[PDB]
């Protein structure tokens, strides 16, 4: 088992590494069709790289690279998309938002750290399972928490795994930087969940629409951090249609597998989206999702964050294109 995965570790140790500037990841509608889990892990190395977090927080080198590969292996392989690639697109949106969006001139590097680590810990060790499934399939982790149990577990595994061996990038942090780190990451991973995002978002939009937002008023700023977090948690939809076909028809088939669990180990009378029968009607029920979190958030992420506009546009392009599949 591990012998093959560590053979992949030599694939890290013995393969060509295309540059991130060659690999279009700075582009928001990026082609992740060709990247392997290894190459996406390398882009994740870029994500830790350019955010100026390593210099500002003294991260260890290979401890970070194998932070990335260890998170790459910890995901159960039965999962269709909510694995390492999901973290790849999420922190792709995070890295791109904090570099291509040039937000660093605004918000502090501490916050860039909280954004990145919470972005890669938006969905740690995701089992193809959301909050609801464990809340009703009753995995012990569910009883371990209450609200946003997967994400309370993602903060739990943030503070745990980063303190766990092979992952101590928190080691270089000063106690203040460390405090702001795990705390803002706490609230943000709570907001990495689309739900507690829906909870926190209204204060944000009220503080954004009037162009009255201020970064010398820090709680608003951290709330913006959480907004970018949720903006990143669903970023896979930003990807191009030939590829997006794969991505959101794996949203289809993977919520049809989790949905198979919804109609085997759960046996609910099916809800319209995750029913497989809506194979040519599921995308509309993605659009109503996109309207509910995506566009609603990327509008504010448009009027404050700037070059991050395509992160909105790169989603909207999918709309009708999925409506086509949603049009039988």
């Amino acid at each position: 088992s591990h012998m093959e995965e560590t053979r992949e570790l030599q694939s890290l140790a013995a393969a060509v590494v295309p540059s991130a500037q060659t690999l279009k990841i700075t582009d928001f509608s990026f082609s992740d069709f060709e990247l392997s889990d290894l190459e996406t892990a390398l882009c994740t190395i870029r994500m830790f790289t350019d955010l100026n977090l390593v210099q500002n927080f003294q991260m260890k080198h290979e401890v970070l690279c194998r932070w990335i590969l260890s998170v790459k292996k910890n995901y159960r392989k039965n999962v269709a998309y909510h694995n390492w690639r999901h973290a790849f697109n999420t922190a792709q949106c995070m890295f791109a938002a904090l570099k291509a969006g040039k937000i660093q001139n605004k918000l502090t590097d501490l916050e860039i750290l909280a954004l990145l680590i919470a972005a890669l810990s938006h969905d740690l060790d995701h089992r193809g399972v959301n909050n609801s499934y464990i809340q009703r399939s009753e995995h012990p982790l569910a009883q371990l928490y209450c609200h946003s149990i997967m994400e309370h577990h993602h903060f739990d595994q943030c503070l745990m795994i980063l303190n766990s061996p092979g992952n101590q990038i928190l080691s270089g942090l000063s106690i203040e930087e460390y405090k702001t780190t795990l705390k803002i990451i706490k609230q943000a991973i709570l907001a990495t969940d689309l739900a507690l995002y829906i909870k926190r978002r209204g204060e944000f939009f009220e503080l954004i629409r009037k162009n009255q937002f201020n970064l010398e008023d820090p709680h608003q700023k951290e709330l913006f951090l959480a907004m970018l977090m949720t903006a990143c948690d669903l970023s896979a939809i930003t990807k191009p249609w030939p590829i997006q076909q794969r991505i959101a028809e794996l949203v289809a088939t993977e919520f049809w597998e989790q949905g198979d669990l919804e109609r085997t180990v759960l046996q609910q009378q099916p809800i319209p989206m995750m029913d497989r029968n809506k194979r040519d009607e599921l995308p509309k029920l993605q659009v109503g999702f996109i309207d509910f979190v995506c566009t609603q958030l990327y509008e504010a992420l448009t009027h404050v964050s700037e070059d991050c506009f395509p992160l909105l546009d790169g989603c909207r392009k999918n709309r009708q294109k999925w409506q086509a599949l949603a049009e039988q």
Binding site: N130, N131, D193, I198, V251, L285
Partner: peptide, 17 residues
């Protein structure tokens, strides 16, 4: 995860929970 009632059925038909 308490939220708006308008959202709940949507939570029951969108990707959230």
């Amino acid at each position: 995860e308490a939220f708006n009632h308008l959202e709940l059925h949507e939570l029951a038909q969108y990707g959230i929970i």
